[PDB]
Structure 1
Amino acid sequence: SDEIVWQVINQSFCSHRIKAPNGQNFCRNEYNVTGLCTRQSCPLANSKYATVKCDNGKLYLYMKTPERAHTPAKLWERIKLSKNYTKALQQIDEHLLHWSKFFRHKCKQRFTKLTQVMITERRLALREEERHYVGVAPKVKRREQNRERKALVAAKIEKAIEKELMDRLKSGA
């Protein structure tokens, strides 16, 4: 039963539970809509669930029902949302007919967040960066410091400058 599973996952070491310093428990399950391990939010403890996911740029409406609880292979019935904010929201509302207000509202919120996350193309389209984050290991740092000091010591910059000056102004102007 869901209640037994809900109790077994609240306590008794649910696999995906993150103990944040604030005390909030964060769920890392991909199918979760809020990412938090709470009631009516964890897909495992809820026979009926709805979430929005996307492999490619297309956004899908993943939903779960008790019918496929016996068949974990094809539990979710994803449907394409025909990417467009207004019509996608209308389609989500139509699909989630008579569903809980919580599920509908949070699915719409997840879809909106994912759609606005697609703006990442803006950063990729207008980046023209000349820095490209570079990491330097401490071992490389040591070889770039002690060797530099040795080169400076062996260079004899003052002596070289004096020799060059004594040569330039000894055979011409």
Structure 2
Amino acid sequence: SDEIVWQVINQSFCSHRIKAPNGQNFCRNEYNVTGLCTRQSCPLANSKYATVKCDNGKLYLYMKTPERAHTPAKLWERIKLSKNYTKALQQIDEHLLHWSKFFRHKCKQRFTKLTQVMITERRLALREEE
């Protein structure tokens, strides 16, 4: 049913979709790795999916499988990426072993950017402590 769901979401109301002036579309979905409404992008469209998303200081990895499509409360499995960037990429590749290259590449890029953002918000909010 993923194709049907995607086609309805495409030619009907993807509520998280925002139509930019260029004509490109952006899904507002927080779990979305690539914030662009496409076949590979909407977590709604695709049963198999993954994302790096920041919670507190941690940069967790969220996993989505067709097996837990029912029971959406427990759908997203939460994995802690190690603070070491190399270890984090290794863990992402391991968990995303035998996993389509699109989500893996996008997940790695999102982890890099979130790490940079965490570094730079530490920068902007440096305090006298320590």
Q: TM-score band (shorter)? A: over 0.9
User: What is the CA-CA distance between 1:12 and the residue it aligns to?
Assistant: 1.1
Q: 1:128 to 1:87 in 2, by over 3 A?
A: closer
For residues 60-97 of structure 1, what are the alpha-carbon distances to aligned partners after superposition, in whole Å with 9 as ceiling and x for unaligned? 11010001111111111010001111110000000111
Q: Distance in 2 between matches of 1:7 and 1:96?
A: 27
| Match in the other structure for 1:111 | 111
Seq. identity, %: 100
SS class of match (2:99) = coil
User: What is the CA-CA distance between 1:129 and the residue it aligns to?
Assistant: 17
Q: Distance in 2 between matches of 1:128 and 1:88?
A: 30
Q: Distance in 2 between matches of 1:22 and 1:127?
A: 41
Q: Distance in 2 between matches of 1:35 and 1:121?
A: 21
Gapped regions of structure 2 (runs ≥ 5): none
User: What is the CA-CA distance between 1:122 and the residue it aligns to?
Assistant: 4.3
Q: 1:9 to 1:59 in 2, by over 3 A?
A: same
Q: 1:11 to 1:115 in 2, by over 3 A?
A: same
User: What is the CA-CA distance between 1:128 and the residue it aligns to?
Assistant: 10
| Match in the other structure for 1:95 | 95
User: What is the CA-CA distance between 1:55 and the residue it aligns to?
Assistant: 1.5
Q: 1:50 to 1:127 in 2, by over 3 A?
A: same
Q: Distance in 2 between matches of 1:122 and 1:10?
A: 39
Q: Distance in 2 between matches of 1:12 and 1:21?
A: 19
For residues 112-159 of structure 1, what are the alpha-carbon distances to aligned partners after superposition, in whole Å with 9 as ceiling and x for unaligned? 0100001233443459999xxxxxxxxxxxxxxxxxxxxxxxxxxxxx
User: What is the CA-CA distance between 1:11 and the residue it aligns to?
Assistant: 1.3
Larger Rg: 1
Q: Which is helix-richer, 1 or 2?
A: 1
Q: Distance in 2 between matches of 1:27 and 1:129?
A: 39
Q: Distance in 1 between matches of 2:121 and 2:40?
A: 33
Instruction: With the length of structure 1 as denominator, give the TM-score of the two structures.
Output: 0.70
Gapped regions of structure 1 (runs ≥ 5): 131-173
Q: Distance in 2 between matches of 1:110 and 1:21?
A: 24
Aligned length: 130
Q: 1:81 to 1:129 in 2, by over 3 A?
A: closer
Instruction: With the length of structure 2 as denominator, give the TM-score of the two structures.
Output: 0.93
